[PDB]
Design a protein around this ligand. Structure first.
Ligand SMILES: CC(=O)N[C@@H]1[C@@H](O)[C@@H](F)[C@@](OP(=O)(O)OC[C@H]2O[C@@H](n3ccc(N)nc3=O)[C@H](O)[C@@H]2O)(C(=O)O)O[C@H]1[C@H](O)[C@H](O)CO
Ligand SMILES: CC(=O)N[C@@H]1[C@@H](O)[C@@H](F)[C@@](OP(=O)(O)OC[C@H]2O[C@@H](n3ccc(N)nc3=O)[C@H](O)[C@@H]2O)(C(=O)O)O[C@H]1[C@H](O)[C@H](O)CO
Ligand SMILES: CC(=O)N[C@@H]1[C@@H](O)[C@@H](F)[C@@](OP(=O)(O)OC[C@H]2O[C@@H](n3ccc(N)nc3=O)[C@H](O)[C@@H]2O)(C(=O)O)O[C@H]1[C@H](O)[C@H](O)CO
Ligand SMILES: CC(=O)N[C@@H]1[C@@H](O)[C@@H](F)[C@@](OP(=O)(O)OC[C@H]2O[C@@H](n3ccc(N)nc3=O)[C@H](O)[C@@H]2O)(C(=O)O)O[C@H]1[C@H](O)[C@H](O)CO
Ligand SMILES: [Cl-]
Ligand SMILES: [Cl-]
Ligand SMILES: [Cl-]
Ligand SMILES: [Cl-]
Lengths: 275, 275, 275, 275
């Protein structure tokens, strides 16, 4: 059971938004607010401990691996590894990014998931600005930034960021990113595309804050992000950091070649080749 | 004249749902409630007697033979063999099961029929669960189970099942299933696909009951089903079991090669080949 | 200027519906009611006199010659030959009759015309009955019958028919039907297809009358129709029968090969060939 | 930030509509009303001085160069050369003018732009008249006329025209129209197509005035237009005519070959070739 709609009440407008950078391991838990929902993205479940607990308000996955991630999320839920209230596909509704067939058939395959573009399109000014920069300049926001936009569109007012490290330093992930299954799905480093940049993520985040009037804090003392956004105040909060049981799902799940999966992958192949 | 909409009133929420297994011949009529509507599916009219009377609230047919079954149902009605209030196509809205063109043109060809998926999609949790199991695991519910889901979505509260025998024993149909017309339409046994299973039907039925809070009884004392669902109480009800007149329609009707039928079959061929 | 919507008021529910049979020349004008709207179809303007006056409430044209007839109607209007309040394309929304592209682009080309199927689809029982007979039996109603269905759907209550002669006798049209332009558009008799029949038109008309509870009269004393529907009562009405000026449009207009007409005819060719 | 909707209030219904003819240089500023919005089209920014000031209520661009003009307009705005409240694509929704894919994907690429046809389609009589003349007679209104129709549909009541000179005389543009970028985008005179005409523009403008009851004035004393529409009264208004800074954008901007631009141009090529 997912939520039918993600509704933010006026009484709790705090959101923690986590990337999967090394600083996920170095959160200052004293700086978390008393109440909050959590957003995670992509390979968050690769984490060896529950760095932000077991309750995820929404997870966010990219269209190119959505089939596998949707199944992985359903297994995380069934195996009681996490509680996941909503599942988004991080989308822009641009036909050189998401194929017509992918968008058309999305809800047919994933009836309880949500296309992210349907939420961020409501941020009119920000949405036009990201499309203009994508189309004409080949600049794209990362999932951390996307999740912020989604949070703002859904009516959260204070964002606390962590695991956002702009792919700098020698540790680039708090885990092995080139796991066996990642290698299989996309045959042969796992580094960001040229369309992504620290400067652009930062500009986009500053724009979200200036247009929509929300507050953005950092949580990780020793992270690059904290040089650009203020660390949240140490309010002496405590946290119980729990380990993952040993046979936790720790790699993206593969799918069996059923008639439906084969149909899906056939189509996805055909138009990923075109794009 | 079909009904425009199937509306269940609070005063009568009982539904009898019949498969076409051998136990259709062995209903304990004393266990039927006083009031009820009846759902039948597929080759129900192959029956040699009116095992559940002449008044069918809805019939349900699979997309692959819908053209012939729609015509057969219109002839059953015109020949006064049955009264049929509604006609559904048992559908899931998955493009590896029902082609885009089939779904797109459905109401164009069959303006007074109803696509079943438009009704079961409202059972959000159950609908997501059947799609997940279909796509990733190649498990599909049988029409008996589908009809239960439809009944629950339309607001029936108590289901009595019969003719559901999970394809076990040596009698598999209370009639000849490989009739001349069945053989012609689909050129050469008539046994269920590997995607269907007793275990899955049962799990899906138990899930419908636990999510939507309805009651499911059996009607056939000597049937496998009764080992999994309680027999309905013997309330001493009586039934007049009527024979079919001799020249009853007893096989699926064939269609003439008109411009419309040829157009339809041409298209259906083209994309059944793709799927 | 066409009407945006054809709205029938309770105070005037009379409609005269004219085919283009020989009996158009033999209307008994004494039998017309005091008040009425008029529907005409196809090559009505071939008439040498204004047999039903100059004011047409709606005209009805077949999809296969709609482009030329739309232009002809606009010229009839511009040249003050008739006043035409509405223009329909007599359609069923069946893809072996009207191509997907024709229906999709209809309003793009003809923004002030109306697709007839959008009106008759509201006659649920009658619409299902004509589709069933078209698809499975290759029986189609003629435009006279279609116009009756449209009238009934729009809320007219009494129909007076004329120019309906079921293609019987030696005079089949009160004019030359194989005119020069008819010959050109559709290169080489102008007789009805096998899908049309007197028996079916009559059955369909009797059905419209029994389902929707309206009255259908004849106006032509010496016509076949009057053997099946009652002649309207001689109420001593009078009529001024006016001649057409000599240079009246008397043949369907041809179109120039503009970029738009060529585009249109290219597409129409491509999928008339498929159908 | 564009406006979400262009809303005309009852208190200000005046619009200045400028073509890019030589008479843009010869506006009689004494004849402008006290209050007004301004519409400009196409290569307006080629102007060497701010002939109508810096505040544009809407700009209008043709589909065939929309990609470049949209980017040019965003740069005019970012560089503070103009303030542009709305951006329209001058469209008719005819598939031989605008491809299906162009219209389908329009808002995907340009989320804050507006398709003009969605506004002028509400002028029912005028819209049917321009489509009839386009399709059957290959007559098309120019952007000046289109902008008038848009203004009337949005509820402006008095139009003042300038820069409309029907491509007559020896000066045809108050600037070089065959600039380097114009030459590149559309490889090798810049004169109007045969579908455009002074007579038709004038007839269409007179029709807008007679159907929708608005007033149309001229502003340029020595222009052809003033022989067909009355010059606005000299009310002794004054105007500060400002020069453009030297490094003003003065040619249409070219786009970089990003994945999105290449995708877009690939598609546009494919179906401009078909049309
Ligand atoms: C190879 C490839 O495709 N790498 C991309 C990567 O360029 C980036 F597009 C992103 O991010 P991904 O690395 O998974 O990590 C999630 C988020 O954590 C933050 N982060 C992470 C590590 C780090 N050192 N500094 C950081 O700031 C970023 O804000 C990022 O959005 C993404 O969606 O933005 O997704 C991955 C994959 O497409 C994805 O993992 C498939 O499931
Ligand atoms: C060859 C083939 O395609 N067999 C399938 C069969 O695997 C099964 F998919 C089903 O069922 P079908 O056998 O017609 O019978 C209808 C229902 O009766 C119940 N039943 C029947 C016999 C039995 N011994 N034990 C039972 O439990 C099942 O719940 C079933 O759903 C179906 O839609 O579920 O449909 C048929 C045909 O596609 C259909 O007849 C075409 O018109
Ligand atoms: C060759 C061809 O295609 N003939 C068909 C004809 O079979 C018939 F389909 C019809 O009728 P069409 O003859 O024009 O005449 C209009 C109506 O007048 C009535 N009538 C006419 C003559 C007659 N002797 N007895 C009659 O009853 C019929 O009710 C008919 O519907 C039609 O749409 O029903 O349309 C024409 C053409 O497709 C059309 O003219 C193209 O513009
Ligand atoms: C080569 C080509 O395609 N020329 C066309 C031209 O035939 C005409 F279609 C138009 O007009 P364009 O010349 O740009 O000028 C804008 C408007 O100013 C008015 N005017 C201009 C000059 C003049 N001497 N007398 C005038 O009356 C007209 O009302 C016109 O609508 C148009 O959209 O109507 O657009 C251009 C281009 O397609 C456009 O510039 C691409 O960005
Ligand atoms: Cl996989
Ligand atoms: Cl058949
Ligand atoms: Cl022609
Ligand atoms: Cl370019």
């Amino acid at each position: 059971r997912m939520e039918n709609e993600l509704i933010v009440s006026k009484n709790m407008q705090n959101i923690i938004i986590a990337g999967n950078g090394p600083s996920l391991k170095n959160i200052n838990y004293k700086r978390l607010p008393r109440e909050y929902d959590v957003f995670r993205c992509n390979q968050f479940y690769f984490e060896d401990k529950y760095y932000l607990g077991k309750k995820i308000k929404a997870v966010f996955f990219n269209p190119g691996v959505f089939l596998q991630q949707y199944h992985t999320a359903k297994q995380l839920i069934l195996k009681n590894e996490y509680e996941i209230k909503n599942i988004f596909c991080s989308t822009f509704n641009l036909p050189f990014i998401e194929s017509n067939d992918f968008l058309h058939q999305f809800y047919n395959f994933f009836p309880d998931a949500k296309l992210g573009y349907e939420v961020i399109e409501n941020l009119k000014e920000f949405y036009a600005y990201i499309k203009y920069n994508e189309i004409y300049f080949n600049k794209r926001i990362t999932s951390g930034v996307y999740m912020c936009a989604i949070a703002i569109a859904l009516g959260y007012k204070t964002i606390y960021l962590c695991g956002i490290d702009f792919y700098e330093g020698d540790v680039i992930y708090p885990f092995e990113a080139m796991s066996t299954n990642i290698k299989t799905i996309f045959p042969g480093d796992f580094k960001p595309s040229n369309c992504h940049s620290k400067e652009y993520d930062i500009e986009a985040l500053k724009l979200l804050k200036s247009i929509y009037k929300v507050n953005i804090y950092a949580l990780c003392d020793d992270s690059i992000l904290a040089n650009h956004f203020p660390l949240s105040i140490n309010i002496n909060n405590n946290f119980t950091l729990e380990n993952k049981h040993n046979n936790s799902i720790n790699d993206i799940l593969l799918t069996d070649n059923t008639p439906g999966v084969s149909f899906y992958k056939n189509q996805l192949k055909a138009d990923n080749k075109i794009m």
